[PDB]
């Protein structure tokens, strides 16, 4: 069998569940569950909560937003070949 080039790698497919709404000062949970690599495995997650907080490396992070507003959440995922996909969602924080 010939060695297959890295350019043939299939990228990770992101499943990202961010609720449309959350409440000020209350824990919300986001889910990356189901994210998969069609020809390998998932090697890492990176969530940006959109509020200046440290990013999370968790699959399914909890977070508290401490001001009302709309936040863009970005999830980047790396597969077992070191290659990446990204998705975004918006959450609106109200009282
Ligand atoms: Ca792959």
Numbering used by the authors: 766 to 860
Q: What did the published study say regarding this structure?
A:
Clostridium histolyticum collagenases ColG and ColH are segmental enzymes that are thought to be activated by Ca2+-triggered domain reorientation to cause extensive tissue destruction. The collagenases consist of a collagenase module (s1), a variable number of polycystic kidney disease-like (PKD-like) domains (s2a and s2b in ColH and s2 in ColG) and a variable number of collagen-binding domains (s3 in ColH and s3a and s3b in ColG). The X-ray crystal structures of Ca2+-bound holo s2a (space group C2), Ca2+-free apo s2a (space group P61), Ca2+-bound holo s2b (space group P21) and two new forms of N-terminally truncated wild-type apo s2 (space groups P21 and P212121) are reported for the first time. Comparison of crystal structures of ColG s2 with crystal structures of ColH s2a and s2b suggests that despite common tertiary folds, PKD-like domains can be grouped into two subsets.
Of the novel s2a and s2b structures, that of s2b was solved at higher resolution and therefore is described in the most detail. Similar to holo s2a, the two NCS-related holo s2b structures are virtually identical (r.m.s.d. of 0.4 Å). Each holo s2b structure begins at residue 766 and the last residue is 860. The first bulge occurs when Pro784 breaks β-strand A and pushes the subsequent Lys785 outwards, which in turn leads to an approximately 127° angle between β-strands A and A′ that also changes the allegiance of β-strand A′ to β-strand G. The second conserved bulge is introduced by Lys798 and Gly799. Temperature factors for both NCS-related structures are low (the average B factor for molecule A is 11.7 Å2 and that for molecule B is 9.9 Å2). Anisotropic B-factor analyses using the Anisotropic Network Model (ANM) web server showed that the main chain is mostly isotropic and that potential correlated movement occurs exclusively at the N-terminal linker. In s2b, the insertion of Asp819 results in the region adopting an ω-loop (i→i + 10). In s2b, Ca2+ chelation by Asn774 and Lys775 could stabilize a 310-helix (residues 770–774) that aligns with the cylinder axis. Meanwhile, the N-terminal linker structure of a PKD-like domain is described for the first time in the holo s2b structure and suggests that Ca2+ repositions the linker along the barrel axis. Of the three domains, s2b is the most stable.
